[PDB]
Amino acid sequence: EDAELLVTVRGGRLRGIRLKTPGGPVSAFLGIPFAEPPMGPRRFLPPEPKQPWSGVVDATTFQSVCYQYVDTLYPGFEGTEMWNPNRELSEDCLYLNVWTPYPRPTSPTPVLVWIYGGGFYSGASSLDVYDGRFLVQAERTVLVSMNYRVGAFGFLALPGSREAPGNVGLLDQRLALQWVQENVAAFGGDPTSVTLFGESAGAASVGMHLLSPPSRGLFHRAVLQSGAPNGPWATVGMGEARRRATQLAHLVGCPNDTELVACLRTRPAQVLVNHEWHVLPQESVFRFSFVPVVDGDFLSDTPEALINAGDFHGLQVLVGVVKDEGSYFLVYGAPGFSKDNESLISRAEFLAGVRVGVPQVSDLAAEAVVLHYTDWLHPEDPARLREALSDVVGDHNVVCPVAQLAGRLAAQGARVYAYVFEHRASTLSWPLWMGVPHGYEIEFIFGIPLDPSRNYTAEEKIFAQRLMRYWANFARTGDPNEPRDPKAPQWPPYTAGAQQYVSLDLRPLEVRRGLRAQACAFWNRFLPKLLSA
Amino acid sequence: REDAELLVTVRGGRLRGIRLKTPGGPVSAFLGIPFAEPPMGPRRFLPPEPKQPWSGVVDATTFQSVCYQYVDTLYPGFEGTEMWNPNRELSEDCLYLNVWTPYPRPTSPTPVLVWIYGGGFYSGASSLDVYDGRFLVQAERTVLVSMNYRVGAFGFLALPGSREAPGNVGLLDQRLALQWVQENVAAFGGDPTSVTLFGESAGAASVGMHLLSPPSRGLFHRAVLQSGAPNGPWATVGMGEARRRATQLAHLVGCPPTGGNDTELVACLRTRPAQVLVNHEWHVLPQESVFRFSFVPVVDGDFLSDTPEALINAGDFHGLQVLVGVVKDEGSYFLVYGAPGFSKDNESLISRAEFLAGVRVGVPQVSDLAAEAVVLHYTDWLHPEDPARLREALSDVVGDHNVVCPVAQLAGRLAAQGARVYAYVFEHRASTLSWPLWMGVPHGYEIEFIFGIPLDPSRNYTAEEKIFAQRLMRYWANFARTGDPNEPRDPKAPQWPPYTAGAQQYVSLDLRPLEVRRGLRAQACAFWNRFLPKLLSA
């Protein structure tokens, strides 16, 4: 019998599994329950801590995926299927996973906690691309990831009601972080060194824990990959949240908040999933119906307000974007776009694309967008229009919110490191015109190219090892730089003035200035003034 | 006794002129021909009355008086400013025009160039040295005409609806002179069927207004707009704002002893000494500005049936040829006239707060939101506080808003709606230029080359500049003759392509051969011409 795979946590006993990597074994405890199953009367409610169990919980395999829509845009295509549920769906989905070195560390090891993205309507900690075994073996960290409720189950809100208060998916994440404080030492993890990292909605989540005092004592450093809590898709106001909840109810044949939630609770989960898409007020390339609500509780103000008011001395943050944030999203509803052709769009398609990529702004606002993103020496060139609409979508939803977060945090005491990830994977299944799309740095951060069964180049493996080192250096010390490595070119901090970041690719680090500074001045400085007056 | 070449009879009577020496040979000049009754006394603010016929011979032998105007004193004695100041005495008795013609008089009808000076509708004169028509006439054998027209309150004070100060009488001065050319230019050997207007700044805006006013449009055939457009934001005013300005001027000079009967008010304005009106005209502007233009053409349904912007958009311009352009640094000259931090005598390396303040004075009368948009577009957000860059950007702001983008818009619409259009950017800095080097090629400093002033032996231009001057005179007179500036039958010479709304091609005018380029500040002017007006509506 293997004692390394037996662990006792506060709730009871667990049996793990030994995993192989090209670099040696790793211990994994997959499918650890951290909440009571949020089912029946507990749907829409805050998570309750998992009650103690007798006997030994089997933690040798990933547990169920939280209920969510399954993307069928390109059935069987790797580029979309790699994000889809790879376990059965269930509301009984509140489990987390721990990877640790083998044999288990006997002194406190830094902890990385992964929060997946997926627009708050999808995702799972069990996706292959979030496999913690390579990071843990290579960099000797403990790695934790949790499932949290998404869609209506995580973020349906009737603000003010006890029956559906909203943000319970974020509370799922917080409960997992509390679980890590209480239990990670039993795995050799150090609860006093916890680094949160997340991508997209995962990054927005990390940002929200930064801005919510009860979460802030549960970790020490933060990594935000291609997402920010101040992204225009990441939150919703109380009034609009109530409207969307009410629309969902009507669409599933339900009619007083108590009566409305009770009716919603009688519906099969799959039925809520089936209707969640058409509660949105405007058509969009984004499928984001239920998201965190600003209601004074989890978030006492908008993330923008909270960010401007905040004292961030003592914080270190690693943030960045991929080279082409907008391109991936354009095939989910921008007219003229497909992964299977060149998507050379016309100016009419461009104008249409703008209304879909930048939903819910005024005509005046949209005009200003078309102004700033047209090359007036080539206003109708299809390739330039394709690139420009990609820019519009990426700038608005990802790059400029991250740049704004970076600048404010740095000016208010945080130490910030910024990157742009610029390597197109040799294995990438999306067409060449999409460049380095959203989501495709993750496989490199998690060291997936080390997996011999996959087909990355030797150069790509060394690159992955570099990225894993940057990330783990940051988790250990707040600084990704090779602690003492004199003659390696250094990653300087990002500042509101000099705005320096590094390019992450197969070449040595190159320092540059400005995260699309000209474009983000538009989104971050001018457009808010417009939507006012 | 008398020289027959210097004698001409026009509809009003007989004229005697003068034989002018030029480096290339003699020219006949008839300077100071009266074309209207003096707009004196009861005739102040009224439309011009045609000059009554006279017996005997009028000596048209020297420039007549400059129309009353403010005299610039910012840099006293400095050439860069004094070259624009009156060089004859001020008088309300100023409605005279000038004809230059080859010596001997042409024997077959000759293309006529008609010059309209700039000066913001508050200043200027046809007698300035830099507008001397003798070099063009000698070198290109055209007939050249220029006129004085009333400026300031005397030409553009308007109490819309009133018969006593209807407004736009300065433009009517120009029109009357154009009618005079139709009726009389043949007597000098000029061709009334080939008349090309040209003008710079307010003169270019006047040229454009004649394009857009049907009773003027019949009096000429082609047009040249140098650094100005009728759709310029400084170039017209609405009826109510014109009346407000007129009324405030009246008030400030004690009339009446505000508003009331227009007849009474104007009668009281007519008793004030000219100089008193001039001394107070700076007071009537609603905002502090670097374009101190108190009285300007008024959009009132008469001379202009609609805004020039609207008239441009709605117009059929088939059969028209037009030549338009700008200098390289349109904005710099205006900044030393009041933008905080600026001086011709230092480098004008301004702060960000000075830049922000400059935007308000260089783009007056726009909302805070609009000013924000301007700061956004013109800040380099990787270098938001670099003084040199801020100086350059403010110069671009002022130039783009007031000159380049109105010209680009005029050019694109005319081209798209039937006109043949040629566009240039003037990029040569005169070896003789007295403004500092940071100003680059400032507003107004192409004019001396177009008029061939470097050929004046008393001046000290380089030989290359004399050659350059001759090239420009050739383009302008080619255009006047044929509607096309290109050398008819010359092929190894670089060609000047027409400007169109799509390709937006123009040429650079400098010591080097023509270089063809694309877009008149196209990214910048998309902001001024396409977006910013939409922000006005919302």
Ligand SMILES: *[C@@H]1O[C@H](CO[C@@H]2O[C@@H](C)[C@@H](O)[C@@H](O)[C@@H]2O)[C@@H](O[C@@H]2O[C@H](CO)[C@@H](O)[C@H](O)[C@H]2NC(C)=O)[C@H](O)[C@H]1NC(C)=O
């Ligand atoms: C590029 O493809 C898009 C998407 O169309 C689909 O994908 C193609 C690869 C092909 O399989 C098509 O048959 C599919 O319909 C094209 O945009 C479509 O254009 C057609 C034209 O009639 C229109 O009916 C669809 O609604 C369009 N789809 C969207 C999402 O707008 C686009 O025309 C292609 N580009 C080309 C052909 O140059």
Ligand SMILES: *[C@@H]1O[C@H](CO[C@@H]2O[C@@H](C)[C@@H](O)[C@@H](O)[C@@H]2O)[C@@H](O[C@@H]2O[C@H](CO)[C@@H](O)[C@H](O)[C@H]2NC(C)=O)[C@H](O)[C@H]1NC(C)=O
């Ligand atoms: C650049 O010059 C301006 C203009 O000031 C005048 O011209 C200068 C060349 C020099 O002779 C000054 O003494 C003159 O007053 C300067 O702006 C002025 O600054 C003074 C004092 O700081 C102030 O009282 C005025 O109001 C300013 N005028 C304007 C229009 O802003 C400017 O500071 C000079 N820059 C330098 C010297 O670096």
Ligand SMILES: *[C@@H]1O[C@H](CO)[C@@H](O)[C@H](O)[C@H]1NC(C)=O
């Ligand atoms: C202004 O006063 C004049 C002067 O007597 C007179 O003709 C008339 O009543 C007034 N004009 C108008 C238009 O009312």
